[PDB]
Amino acid sequence: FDEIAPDAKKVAIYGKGGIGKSTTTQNTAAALAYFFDKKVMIHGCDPKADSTRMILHGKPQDTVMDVLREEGEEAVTLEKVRKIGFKDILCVESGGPEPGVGCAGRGVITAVDMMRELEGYPDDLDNLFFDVLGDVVCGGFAMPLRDGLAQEIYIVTSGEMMALYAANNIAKGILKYAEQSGVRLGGIICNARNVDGEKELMDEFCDKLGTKLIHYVPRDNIVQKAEFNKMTVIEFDPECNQAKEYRTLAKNIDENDELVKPTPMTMDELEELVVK
Amino acid sequence: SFDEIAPDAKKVAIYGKGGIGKSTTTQNTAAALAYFFDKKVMIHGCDPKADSTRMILHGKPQDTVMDVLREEGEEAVTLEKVRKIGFKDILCVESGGPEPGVGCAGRGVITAVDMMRELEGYPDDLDNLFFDVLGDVVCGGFAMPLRDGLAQEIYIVTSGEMMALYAANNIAKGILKYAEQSGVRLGGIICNARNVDGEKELMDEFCDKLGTKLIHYVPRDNIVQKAEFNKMTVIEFDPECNQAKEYRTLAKNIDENDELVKPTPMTMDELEELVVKYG
Ligand SMILES: Nc1ncnc2c1ncn2[C@@H]1O[C@H](COP(=O)(O)OP(=O)(O)O)[C@@H](O)[C@H]1O
Ligand SMILES: Nc1ncnc2c1ncn2[C@@H]1O[C@H](COP(=O)(O)OP(=O)(O)O)[C@@H](O)[C@H]1O
Ligand code: SF4
Ligand SMILES: [Mg+2]
Ligand SMILES: [Mg+2]
Numbered sequence: 001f002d003e004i005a006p007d008a009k010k011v012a013i014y015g016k017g018g019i020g021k022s023t024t025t026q027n028t029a030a031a032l033a034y035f036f037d038k039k040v041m042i043h044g045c046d047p048k049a050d051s052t053r054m055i056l057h058g059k060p061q062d063t064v065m066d067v068l069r070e071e072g073e074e075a076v077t078l079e080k081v082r083k084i085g086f087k088d089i090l091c092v093e094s095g096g097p098e099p100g101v102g103c104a105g106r107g108v109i110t111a112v113d114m115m116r117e118l119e120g121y122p123d124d125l126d127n128l129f130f131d132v133l134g135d136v137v138c139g140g141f142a143m144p145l146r147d148g149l150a151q152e153i154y155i156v157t158s159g160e161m162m163a164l165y166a167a168n169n170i171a172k173g174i175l176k177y178a179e180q181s182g183v184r185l186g187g188i189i190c191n192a193r194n195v196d197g198e199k200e201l202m203d204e205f206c207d208k209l210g211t212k213l214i215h216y217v218p219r220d221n222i223v224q225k226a227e228f229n230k231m232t233v234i235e236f237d238p239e240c241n242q243a244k245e246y247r248t249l250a251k252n253i254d255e256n257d258e259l260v261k262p263t264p265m266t267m268d269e270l271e272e273l274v275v276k
Numbered sequence: 277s278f279d280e281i282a283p284d285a286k287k288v289a290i291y292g293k294g295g296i297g298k299s300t301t302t303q304n305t306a307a308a309l310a311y312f313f314d315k316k317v318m319i320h321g322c323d324p325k326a327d328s329t330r331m332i333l334h335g336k337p338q339d340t341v342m343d344v345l346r347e348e349g350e351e352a353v354t355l356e357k358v359r360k361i362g363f364k365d366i367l368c369v370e371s372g373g374p375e376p377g378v379g380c381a382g383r384g385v386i387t388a389v390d391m392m393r394e395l396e397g398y399p400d401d402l403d404n405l406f407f408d409v410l411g412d413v414v415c416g417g418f419a420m421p422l423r424d425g426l427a428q429e430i431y432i433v434t435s436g437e438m439m440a441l442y443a444a445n446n447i448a449k450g451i452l453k454y455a456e457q458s459g460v461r462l463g464g465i466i467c468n469a470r471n472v473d474g475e476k477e478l479m480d481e482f483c484d485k486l487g488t489k490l491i492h493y494v495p496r497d498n499i500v501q502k503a504e505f506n507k508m509t510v511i512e513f514d515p516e517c518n519q520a521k522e523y524r525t526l527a528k529n530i531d532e533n534d535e536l537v538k539p540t541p542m543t544m545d546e547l548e549e550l551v552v553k554y555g
Contacts, residue, residue, distance in 0.1 A: 016294060016295075017293060017294065017412055017439050017443065018293075018437065018438065018439025018440075018442075047413070047446075048442065050544075060544065097415075098449060098453065099414035099415075099419075099446040099447065099449040099450035099453065100414045100415065100419045100422060100423070100449070100450035100453040100454060101415075101453065102415060103380075103415050103416065104413040104414070104415045133412075133413070135294055135410075135412030135413060136324070136381040136410070136412060136413055137376040137377050137381070138374075138376075138377065138378075138379060138380050138381045139380065142376075142377045145377060146377070160295065161295065162294050162295030163295075165325065166294070169376045170376070172375060172376040172377070173376040173377035176375070176376065176377040176378070177377060228552075267337065
């Protein structure tokens with residue numbers, strides 16, 4: 001597993017559904033490519049299949065599962081599943097079986113295994129991102145931790161109880177495979193929802209987890225404005241304040257050395273924190 | 277058999293995105309069926325959060341079937357330890373699940389349902405049986421109520437949020453998959469509102485396009501948190517407040533529902549176009 005892009009920083013973004021992982025992952029990769037001239041690649045490990053939409057310009061990426069299901073195994077080619085977007089950013093979408101068919105994470109197992117057999121992860125890569133579903137940590141969604149695809153893990157979360165609960169469960173999964181695959185929690189990204197005391201709550205949450213608040217991403221309308229124009233915030237307006245926020249986060253992730261084993265909290269501890 | 281499980285009872289399953297209000301809606305719905313309509317109700321929590329029967333038992337989360345199995349053992353688990361009575365004699369069971377990363381998150385649901393069949397935990401004299409299921413992913417134990425046909429009527433809790441409607445649309449796809457196989461159907465859509473203008477209108481069009489009906493528009497009320505701090509469900513805390521009357525209306529609409537349908541899920545373009553139209 002160490003042969004996959006050895007000179008690249010392999011990162012995986014986890015979090016609750018709709019908490020802002022696809023938005024953070026895309027804008028961070030765009031900032032690394034546009035501002036720091038880094039060769040980046042995004043591998044969408046979310047069954048929603050829209051983790052690479054704004055980098056590909058409002059062009060939903062045919063998932064690996066979609067191509068494999070209709071066309072066949074021999075028909076899966078790097079040119080078809082792996083498309084190029086903004087600042088030569090490589091994009092791949094795992095997808096998944098239709099709801100109820102089978103394991104939701106299966107799509108991640110097949111796409112990662114096929115990407116290895118097809119050599120879709122260039123050696124000259126600088127950064128590789130895995131946008132993974134964090135509502136459940138199991139099967140294909142737990143593969144980046146179990147198999148050690150990404151060594152640095154970052155969990156996007158907001159102030160709401162459910163977002164922190166999912167983040168705490170992801171920390172439990174990281175601890176489970178920390179010694180087994182050398183996976184570690186880089187930091188916690190806070191996709192804020194403009195609430196007073198949220199920034200203070202996250203500081204105590206990260207302190208109790210034994211990690212750091214890598215960045216406080218504010219809620220900005222420019223994200224929607226850029227989305228409605230089939231683009232990312234960096235590509236739409238790299239001079240706006242939100243673009244400078246993603247640039248700071250991109251630099252912090254790529255220059256992060258404080259990788260730690262988290263100390264998850266009990267339900268009572270987490271409940272006592274949200275009320276405070 | 278599956279149909280043998282409480283034959284004279286209405287078997288319902290509540291699905292939806294995480295933190296959308298499935299546990300709150302299910303508990304208050306069951307409390308209104310037991311208090312206002314004198315029905316014998318039971319709740320089976322199929323969510324790994326393990327707090328689907330918290331307010332019915334009053335405050336403290338219930339020991340899950342997986343927890344008692346992971347600590348005591350297979351023979352040491354009894355119907356008394358896993359099924360506990362709460363407000364208005366409502367029976368409560370919590371499936372739980374494995375520790376994050378260990379294995380299939382839904383495995384706790386299979387183990388608890390099979391163990392409940394063997395221990396005969398579903399009384400025959402039941403009137404209503406609810407399953408609070410995780411809807412972020414429709415697979416494994418979370419898809420069992422659809423696949424095995426534990427519940428014939430399914431209700432999805434959702435709001436105007438894009439992700440909430442996306443999860444609801446995926447649940448509809450899963451219902452359609454097992455509709456012919458196990459006779460499972462979509463009863464309706466419950467809207468746990470977030471007090472936004474045009475949200476009701478959005479839900480009316482969402483249900484129209486899905487080929488179903490908006491069973492009820494549950495408003496966002498602070499009395500829910502107030503009742504939660506007093507270790508109680510809204511019905512038990514103040515059955516005369518407006519929110520209690522809203523849950524009472526929903527409870528009778530579900531119990532008196534016949535319009536069970538095979539949904540017509542929407543494409544991603546159709547769903548975005550709808551969210552952009554109103555929002
Ligand atoms: N920093 C932000 N500011 C404003 N809106 C955001 C931000 N991040 C995400 N969003 C919005 O939140 C919604 C969900 O974002 P998304 O990244 O797709 O969540 P996820 O990938 O975790 O499911 C989108 O409509 C997006 O526009
Ligand atoms: N009708 C409502 N009005 C106000 N708050 C609500 C309502 N329904 C749910 N909530 C709140 O939303 C949060 C999540 O509710 P919950 O039922 O646990 O979601 P789920 O079971 O789907 O994860 C809780 O803090 C609860 O107080
Ligand atoms: S391992 Fe996870 S994604 Fe796979 S069937 Fe089980 S709960 Fe679903
Ligand atoms: Mg996404
Ligand atoms: Mg619940």
